[PDB]
Amino acid sequence: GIFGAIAGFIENGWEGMIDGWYGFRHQNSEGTGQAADLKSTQAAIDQINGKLNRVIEKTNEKFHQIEKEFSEVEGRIQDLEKYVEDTKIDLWSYNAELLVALENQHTIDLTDSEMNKLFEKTRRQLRENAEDMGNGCFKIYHKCDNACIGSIRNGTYDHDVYRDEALNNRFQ
Amino acid sequence: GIFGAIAGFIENGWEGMIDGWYGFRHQNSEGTGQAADLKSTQAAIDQINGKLNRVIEKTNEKFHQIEKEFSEVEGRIQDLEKYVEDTKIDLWSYNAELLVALENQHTIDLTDSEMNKLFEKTRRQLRENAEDMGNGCFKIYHKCDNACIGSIRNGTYDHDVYRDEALNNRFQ
Amino acid sequence: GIFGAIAGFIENGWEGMIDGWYGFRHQNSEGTGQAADLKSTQAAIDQINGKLNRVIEKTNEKFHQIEKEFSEVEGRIQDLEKYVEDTKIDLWSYNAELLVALENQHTIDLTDSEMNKLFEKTRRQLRENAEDMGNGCFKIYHKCDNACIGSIRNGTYDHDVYRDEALNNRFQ
Amino acid sequence: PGATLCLGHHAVPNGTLVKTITNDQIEVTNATELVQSSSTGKICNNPHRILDGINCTLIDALLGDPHCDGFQNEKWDLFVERSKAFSNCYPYDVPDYASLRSLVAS
Amino acid sequence: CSSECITPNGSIPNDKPFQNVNKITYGACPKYVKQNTLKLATGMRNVPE
Ligand SMILES: *[C@@H]1O[C@H](CO)[C@@H](O[C@@H]2O[C@H](CO)[C@@H](O)[C@H](O)[C@H]2NC(C)=O)[C@H](O)[C@H]1NC(C)=O
Ligand SMILES: *[C@@H]1O[C@H](CO)[C@@H](O[C@@H]2O[C@H](CO)[C@@H](O)[C@H](O)[C@H]2NC(C)=O)[C@H](O)[C@H]1NC(C)=O
Ligand SMILES: *[C@@H]1O[C@H](CO)[C@@H](O)[C@H](O)[C@H]1NC(C)=O
Ligand SMILES: *[C@@H]1O[C@H](CO)[C@@H](O)[C@H](O)[C@H]1NC(C)=O
Ligand SMILES: *[C@@H]1O[C@H](CO)[C@@H](O)[C@H](O)[C@H]1NC(C)=O
Ligand SMILES: *[C@@H]1O[C@H](CO)[C@@H](O)[C@H](O)[C@H]1NC(C)=O
Hints:
Keywords: immunoglobulin, virus attachment and entry, immune recognition, VIRAL PROTEIN-IMMUNE SYSTEM complex
CATH class of chain A: Alpha Beta
Largest sheet of chain A: 2 strands, antiparallel
Oligomer: part of a larger assembly
Strand order of the largest sheet of chain D: 2-3
CATH architecture of chain A: Alpha-Beta Complex
Helix content of chain D: 10-25%
Shape of chain A: rod-shaped
Number of helices of chain A: 4
Largest interface: A-D, 50 and 27 residues
PDB class: viral protein/immune system
Radius of gyration of chain A: 27 Å
Number of strands of chain A: 5
Shape of chain D: rod-shaped
Protein name (chain E): Hemagglutinin HA1 chain
Distance between the termini of chain A: 38 Å
Helix content of chain A: 40-55%
Strand content of chain D: 15-25%
Organism of A, B, C: Influenza A virus
Distance between the termini of chain D: 83 Å
CATH topology of chain A: Hemagglutinin Ectodomain, Chain B
Structural class of chain A: alpha+beta
Order of helices and strands of chain A: EEHEHEEHH
Strand order of the largest sheet of chain A: 1-2
Bound molecules: a molecule of 2 linked components (NAG-NAG), 2-acetamido-2-deoxy-beta-D-glucopyranose
Chains A, B, C: Hemagglutinin HA2 chain
């Protein structure tokens, strides 16, 4: 993907994350656990639904048209009728092929984006209290219990509370 | 947007910025002020104009064609003439719809990009003298008067000048 | 490009890099040298080849069709035959124009991406042992001989080995 | 003493392969079919008014071939001509048959 | 039964934008294409261990 997160610096996805599309796993003094991030899951899904609504959209309505099957050889005028239909089908076939390929490239890129946005939002929250370990994981340089982890996921983690402790651990 | 800046980590736009598309607002010992960034404004605009020139481009010229309105019922040959025109109009209608939707997605993404490029160029300039506060703002850990702010916007800010002072403030 | 690396924070390309599309140049106690990065070169190329295979793909096969050149003035039916062909050619001309323009925009963006992915993978490897100098270059704050540089390119550089030394140099 | 916080995304046991701009087969978590390829096999009699021609072509119902007398004054949204139809009156031909059948049908 | 789109093979649903059933149609029908399948991704890259 164009951001390098999914199938990039995050080695692989999590089959055990069954209640969201993106999320956090943590390790701390009390153990390990997981949680979905709703707002990024919803972002990816909303975009994808936007794209579905545009495509699953009302088919045109046509009634009487030209004929497209013929029981007798007639020559010039039937040549035309066939060429007309064959030309339309090829054009529409091309459109459908291109559409699906563009959308799919964009779908894979936008979901990559969201993963990357969530990571960056997290990196920003932690300030000087953590280092990026390169695989999508943050080493956090202070005691960080389940509530603390919870505040990181809520967006109410106050880095100044932990700053003297983390800076001390980071630089020795 | 695909980078997460506009309508992302920057809460909202500035109606008061009337002389550029992107810019800086600062707070320091002398007060607060604003300034447009010309080079990123010009980047967004140039791309958008490129895209306009491609689209507003010379319409094709057609002269004598087929007829498209008919006062008498005729059957087979008029069925064909109508089907031919109806097929072309639908194809062109589809093209126009797709074009506008692709371009608009790309326009919103490229302008997002520029905002994000400007931010990153700034983060790089400041080195160890500032921290990203998460909302598009840099906390600068040294006295930074209007000229100093000016040098950050000119691209001639010399971080080594302020480094001992900032490192001292950042780590305590 | 949409990431800001090629023709952005990297001033220019290297005509001397003749064995890869992306790579490293280093300066250290033993001198200066260069090396290609194979895995990012291969990523860009693979994508581009994917896109070529989709396009250079089997042309459709048509046989008997309508006529497209005429030696006598005939009126209504020849008007139709010409209008049909002229309509198809314009539609295909449009498709080909759009295709090439979309692909080219995406090709320039994906190669930009790869350059940027490689940089970020590197920044992550070095942790607290280096600072980004803004022009695509990392200042490394420890003695880093040819093997050390080699380990950075292999992906087996162990930042903890150099950490006390770098932190000491960085903060003074 | 510290913690580790890991960022990630889901995967599924049964991915499906789709086509992209740069990749002929790449695996995603889910996808949806955009080409209808099956039919129930029947013509539905709502919401369009279907008139089954049974043994009769439109032209025969027009002229009033005796076995087609049941079609006198009928209306239709879609007239269905069956392959088993047959003529059983005076042997006739229509110059531009296709056009007559078209304009009546329409 | 009820269905907006008719083909000589029988009626077809019209929830999808394209169809491979018959170039001949009546009503509100998906557009006819040569492909028998086109899958539109509705999730991210599947990347298992
Ligand atoms: C595969 O993708 C589709 C489209 O996003 C999903 O189908 C939808 O699921 C919702 C919620 O359960 C339904 O209410 C909709 O009616 C479905 N939409 C369509 C287009 O059918 C589905 O979630 C995915 N399939 C699996 C197994 O996850
Ligand atoms: C709908 O009807 C058409 C025509 O009756 C079917 O197309 C035929 O497909 C078979 C087998 O693939 C070919 O041997 C015939 O030559 C085709 N006939 C024509 C005129 O194209 C088609 O299979 C039917 N569609 C479905 C899905 O039932
Ligand atoms: C989430 O935020 C709420 C509201 O501020 C707070 O009460 C709670 O402690 C946070 N969650 C956790 C698990 O700490
Ligand atoms: C901008 O750069 C110029 C030229 O180097 C310099 O004279 C000036 O001090 C800078 N601007 C401000 C407001 O400091
Ligand atoms: C590259 O990695 C290999 C295998 O671990 C190692 O032997 C070598 O030292 C590294 N390359 C250089 C130039 O140091
Ligand atoms: C149609 O034709 C066949 C042969 O005449 C006959 O047996 C059948 O009854 C006819 N069908 C109807 C419904 O009139």
